[PDB]
């Protein structure tokens, strides 16, 4: 698809047999989601947006479907107001910013 | 242009007559630029993201050249870690996400 930006670029994501919603975010390096009791070991990490820093849990090798497209990568889990698909997964689905 | 997301989508912008560098951010409703002086009256505003809220001065109807494309719209001046072009101006230059 070609998604204009008049509203938030929200898509359906599936991760661990749970359908959720996420923002296609060109300004996020990493993918940040709410808790979904992800399987596997994790590492603690700090991330920051405008407003300061949050404590997150880093899970690698996570399988996720983004608007139908299958992707695999690092998903950080922490207190994020909205679920965020960062460039790290956006590149996997071939997402580009065009104008 | 078509911009892949293997690195931060940074572009040259011109604002207040100054050339600056800024991030094309589809996850941002608003445009947030580091401390600079701009013409017209501003109003005090608080914007939120990950980590919490910051205080910005809101200027309306600011002319801005994003990667050679003129746009007019609201610009928030504040203590941002990086200059951010939000959807409010991305829509002004016809930017779309594509995959
Ligand atoms: O003092 C300033 O220079 C601006 C203060 C300011 C900007 N946005 C704000 C929001 C709430 C309270 C104060 C502010």
Give the list of residues 6+ apart from residue A51 with CB closer than 8 angstroms, or none: B48, B49, B50, B51, B52, B53, B54
Q: What is the DSSP string of B52-74?
A: EEEEEEEEEEEEEEETTEEEEEE
By Cβ distance, the residue of B48, B52, B95 closest to A98 is B95
How many Å apart are CA B57 and CA A13, to the nearest integer? 35
Yes or no: say if A38 and A59 are a contact pair by the CB < 8 Å rule: yes
Please tell me if residue B40 touches chain A, with a CB cutoff of 8 Å.
Answer: no
Resolution value in angstroms: 2.4
Q: By C-alpha distance, which of A44, A64, A65 is closest to A55? A: A44
H and E: helices and strands count for chain B? 1, 9
How many Å apart are CA A15 and CA B44, to the nearest integer? 40
**How far apart are the CA of B88 and the centre of ligand 1, in A?**
21
**How far apart are the CA of B55 and the centre of ligand 1, in A?**
5
| Active-site amino acid positions of A | 25
Domain boundaries, chain A: 1-99
Yes or no: say if B29 and B8 are a contact pair by the CB < 8 Å rule: no
Q: Is the CB of B53 under 6 A from ligand 1?
A: no
Residue of A66, A76, A90, A97 to mutate when probing chain B, most B C-beta within 10 A: A97
Positions of E strands within chain A: 2-3, 10-14, 19-24, 32-33, 43-49, 52-66, 69-77, 84-85, 96-98
CATH annotation of A1-99: 2.40.70.10
């Amino acid at each position: 698809p070609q998604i204009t930006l008049w509203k938030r670029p929200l898509v359906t994501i599936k991760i661990g047999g749970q359908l959720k919603e996420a923002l296609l975010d060109t300004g996020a390096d990493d993918t940040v989601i709410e808790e979904m009791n992800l399987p596997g070991r994790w590492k603690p990490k700090m991330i920051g947006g405008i407003g300061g820093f949050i404590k997150v849990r880093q899970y690698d090798q996570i399988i996720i479907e983004i608007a139908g497209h299958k992707a695999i990568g690092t998903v950080l889990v922490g207190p994020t107001p909205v679920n965020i698909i960062g460039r790290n997964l956006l590149t996997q689905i071939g997402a580009t910013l065009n104008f």
